[PDB]
Amino acid sequence: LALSLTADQMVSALLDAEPPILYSEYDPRPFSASMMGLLTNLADRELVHMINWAKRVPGFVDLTLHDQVHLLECAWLEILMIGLVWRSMEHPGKLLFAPNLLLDRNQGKCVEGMVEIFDMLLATSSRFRMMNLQGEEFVCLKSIILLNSGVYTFTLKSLEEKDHIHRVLDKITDTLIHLMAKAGLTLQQQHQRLAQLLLILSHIRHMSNKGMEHLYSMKCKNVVPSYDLLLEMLDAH
Amino acid sequence: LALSLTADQMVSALLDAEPPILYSEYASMMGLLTNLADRELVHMINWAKRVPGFVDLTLHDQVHLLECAWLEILMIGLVWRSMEHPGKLLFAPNLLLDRNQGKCVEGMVEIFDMLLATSSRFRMMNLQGEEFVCLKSIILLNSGVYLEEKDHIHRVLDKITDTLIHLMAKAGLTLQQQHQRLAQLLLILSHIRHMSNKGMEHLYSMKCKNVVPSYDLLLEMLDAHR
Numbered sequence: 041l042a043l044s045l046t047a048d049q050m051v052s053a054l055l056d057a058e059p060p061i062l063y064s065e066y067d068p069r070p071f072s073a074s075m076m077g078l079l080t081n082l083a084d085r086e087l088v089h090m091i092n093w094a095k096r097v098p099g100f101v102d103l104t105l106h107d108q109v110h111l112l113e114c115a116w117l118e119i120l121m122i123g124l125v126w127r128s129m130e131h132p133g134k135l136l137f138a139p140n141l142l143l144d145r146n147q148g149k150c151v152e153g154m155v156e157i158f159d160m161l162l163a164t165s166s167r168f169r170m171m172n173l174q175g176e177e178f179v180c181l182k183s184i185i186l187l188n189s190g191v192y193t194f195t196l197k198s199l200e201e202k203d204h205i206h207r208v209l210d211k212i213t214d215t216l217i218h219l220m221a222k223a224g225l226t227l228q229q230q231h232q233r234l235a236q237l238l239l240i241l242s243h244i245r246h247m248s249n250k251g252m253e254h255l256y257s258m259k260c261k262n263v264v265p266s267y268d269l270l271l272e273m274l275d276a277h
Numbered sequence: 278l279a280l281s282l283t284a285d286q287m288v289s290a291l292l293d294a295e296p297p298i299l300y301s302e303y304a305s306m307m308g309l310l311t312n313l314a315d316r317e318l319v320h321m322i323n324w325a326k327r328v329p330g331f332v333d334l335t336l337h338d339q340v341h342l343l344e345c346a347w348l349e350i351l352m353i354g355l356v357w358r359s360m361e362h363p364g365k366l367l368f369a370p371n372l373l374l375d376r377n378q379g380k381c382v383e384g385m386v387e388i389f390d391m392l393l394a395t396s397s398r399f400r401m402m403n404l405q406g407e408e409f410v411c412l413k414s415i416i417l418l419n420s421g422v423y424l425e426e427k428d429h430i431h432r433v434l435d436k437i438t439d440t441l442i443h444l445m446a447k448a449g450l451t452l453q454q455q456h457q458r459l460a461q462l463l464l465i466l467s468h469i470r471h472m473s474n475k476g477m478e479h480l481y482s483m484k485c486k487n488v489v490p491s492y493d494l495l496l497e498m499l500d501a502h503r
């Protein structure tokens with residue numbers, strides 16, 4: 041039961057749940073149309089692993105299927121983006137979409153309207169580096185995004201669901217504090233770092249919104265995962 | 278100067294810096310809201326200049342922070358004055374609107390509902406004025422912060438965190454409760470960013486004369502020394 045986990049058990053559950061790092065193809069490239077096709081193909085494959093990951097975040101499968109879908113509809117691009125930033129952290133000036141799709145700013149220019157968001161993503165990677173963000177902190181933040189982003193936009197059942205999400209979010213706060221304490225930070229340093237980490241989430245939200253507007257401007261048939269697509273992925277037998 | 282303030286001195290400074298509540302002057306609905314927002318802007322700049330550490334930034338950087346934060350700041354203010362009015366948004370004391378009135382503006386109701394939900398969250402948490410004033414200052418300093426200038430902003434942000442924790446400690450919260458409440462408050466800021474992004478998209482969709490305050494307007498309001 042999610043609310044019974046110790047901080048150590050929460051960390052271990054989240055690290056265990058992590059999705060794999062996917063590749064692009066692989067063909068002894070480059071890309072004109074082509075770059076967006078590769079990125080779309082990658083994102084579409086990552087979404088499947090994201091659903092698997094979400095179902096392993098403690099407390100998530102306790103929610104109704106409807107609410108699970110809503111949280112993912114709200115969070116999916118933020119989650120792709122924070123994953124991208126983490127993968128890119130050790131690669132100054134580059135975004136590691138995949139190990140074989142490692143792009144710089146000038147390659148971002150090849151997609152109309154992409155550079156400004158590319159720059160925001162690079163700045164977030166820089167911030168992660170400057171904070172020396174740890175993998176255990178990263179998995180906490182990604183779980184927070186999943187549970188928090190859609191909770192403000194959802195009856196008696198809904199009240200029960202929100203209470204549960206808030207309790208699990210509190211457990212994740214406890215877990216972040218535990219990690220910082222185990223690492224030797226003073227109480228003051230712990231609360232300052234907790235705040236610094238959580239403020240990053242506002243920037244991640246900003247980038248997701250700006251990215252979604254950009255995706256929509258491309259006039260493709262499909263931009264967002266539909267309710268029933270998420271449903272089927274989540275609505276397992 | 279600013280980084281030597283105690284937590285108590287920080288709180289007093291922020292409370293003292295609070296802008297006034299303006300009245301609406303009286304398609305019409307949006308005309309009224311646009312006029313109100315335009316008038317609130319100067320008062321926001323006056324407030325910003327009183328947030329400890331803000332005026333130590335270059336004017337260029339002060340303007341950038343305002344360009345990034347202005348709508349989030351209007352929104353958090355709206356949410357705060359609407360706390361004690363469940364189901365309604367108190368844009369002005371003479372402009373209290375419910376969601377049915379938000380429906381009269383094409384594309385507004387979705388954001389209206391988000392704002393109401395935020396006000397509802399504030400109510401449930403029993404958000405205090407001293408905490409509100411800290412959160413608003415964090416929006417100002419954090420929203421545009423994407424070397425010496427960034428370091429200064431981060432030191433000020435750390436002082437506001439310390440201040441928030443101090444307020445909680447004095448109120449008798451356990452260490453666990455302090456950390457949990459700090460997190461709860463900061464996560465609401467992600468929702469305020471979201472509402473500002475959606476609101477900006479909405480305002481742009483209206484195809485009015487103008488949406489964002491210009492660099493020159495903000496700089497003029499900041500009233501440079503001479």
Ligand SMILES: O=C(c1ccc(OCCN2CCCCC2)cc1)c1c(-c2ccc(O)cc2)sc2cc(O)ccc12
Pocket residue numbers: 079080082083084086087120121123124137153154157158250251252254255262263264265266
């Ligand atoms: O390029 C993409 C991207 C491309 C297509 C996407 O969606 C394709 C539509 N697809 C439909 C079915 C459901 C899943 C989405 C999503 C992201 C990525 C990003 C992006 C960056 C800047 C910007 O302006 C817009 C997006 S960030 C990102 C991280 C990834 O791991 C993968 C792709 C990406």
Ligand SMILES: O=C(c1ccc(OCCN2CCCCC2)cc1)c1c(-c2ccc(O)cc2)sc2cc(O)ccc12
Pocket residue numbers: 310311313314315317318351352354355368384385388389475476477479480487488489490491
């Ligand atoms: O309606 C407005 C609003 C109207 C016009 C605005 O900008 C007018 C352009 N003006 C140009 C010169 C610089 C200042 C802005 C900003 C907010 C307000 C809001 C809003 C809500 C929902 C939504 O979908 C969009 C906006 S929130 C708000 C809070 C206020 O204190 C005042 C107006 C408002």
